[PDB]
Design a protein around this ligand. Structure first.
Ligand code: ADP
Ligand code: QWS
Length: 263
């Protein structure tokens, strides 16, 4: 089962604060060390989430952070995840800026691409892929996390394309216009993630408001090439940012293309 009883969890240390609550390092009885995220009441549709648990627990891949289960005996509920020692990728890049070899940055993109190729085959859409949603583990492995979570977030300012906190910077035109999510909209987001990785954690379109990003993208403007990205890597980024979803590569194609470049 995916239900974890409160007696099977022990909170050891606070890791940090998230959008919807605290994150602790803890232990899960007879299992492993875990990261536990406490979810503020009202932040997510808990009943909708619990309905998909039996199906979603079957997803397992080396490049996806495992969500082991939920502790829901009383509010606030807890989500129990695999512990990722080095934390989020966006912070990891920013803190180690200037210490990365270009091969390591391409390797991080390849780990994410592998995890995303598994979700694409599984017909699971992430909806908010970004470096902030990737985590860094043992020996600097990158794993994707939080796929599908925006379908349960109750704050309309984040989930509505016309909302003030919407992640427009990682959104394809059909997502920011119509909320038309697909694995091809995740490919657009993946191109922005590659830009974040090769820029060592810079924020995309930092000099633009959300409406300015929409106008810029719609008139054909794209993110500039980071210094560390080769012209071949930047070409693949641009393929992710094609206006028509049908013209973007699938993750299965990107994985082969990026691997050929790396190997
Ligand atoms: N699985 C995990 N393992 C280790 N640290 C984690 C894990 N999930 C989240 N964290 C850490 O918890 C903090 C907040 O996490 P996150 O829940 O992603 O907040 P937010 O959703 O606002 O980004 C960050 O410092 C992040 O590195
Ligand atoms: C206990 C888990 C399996 O329950 C759910 C229920 C609904 C879900 C809906 C969307 C996505 C889910 N989801 C998210 C996951 N992992 C991370 N790191 O976010 C996993 C997994 N199997 O590792 N499943 C869900 C996971």
């Amino acid at each position: 089962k995916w239900v974890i009883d409160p007696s099977e969890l022990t909170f050891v240390q606070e890791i940090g604060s998230g959008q919807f609550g605290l994150v602790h390092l803890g232990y899960w009885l007879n299992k492993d060390k875990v990261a536990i995220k406490t979810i503020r009441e009202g932040a997510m549709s808990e009943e909708d989430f619990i309905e998909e648990a039996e199906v979603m627990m079957k997803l397992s891949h080396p490049k996806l952070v495992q969500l082991y289960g939920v502790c829901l005996e009383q509010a606030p509920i807890c989500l129990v995840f695999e512990f990722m020692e080095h934390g989020c990728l966006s912070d990891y890049l920013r803190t180690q800026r200037g210490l990365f070899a270009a091969e390591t940055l391409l390797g991080m993109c390849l780990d994410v691409c592998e995890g995303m190729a598994y979700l694409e085959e599984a017909c699971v859409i992430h909806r908010d892929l970004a470096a902030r949603n990737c985590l860094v583990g043992e020996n600097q492995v990158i794993k994707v996390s939080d796929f599908g979570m925006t379908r349960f977030v109750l704050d309309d300012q984040y989930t509505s394309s016309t909302g003030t906190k919407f992640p427009v910077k990682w959104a394809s035109p059909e997502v920011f216009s119509f909320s038309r999510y697909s694995s091809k909209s995740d490919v657009w987001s993946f191109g922005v993630l590659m830009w974040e990785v090769f820029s060592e954690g810079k924020i995309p379109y930092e000099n633009r408001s959300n409406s300015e990003v929409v106008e810029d993208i719609s008139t054909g403007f794209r993110l500039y090439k980071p210094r560390l990205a080769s012209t071949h890597v930047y070409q693949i980024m641009n393929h992710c940012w094609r206006e028509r979803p049908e013209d973007r590569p699938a993750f299965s194609r990107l994985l082969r293309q990026l691997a050929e470049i790396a190997e």
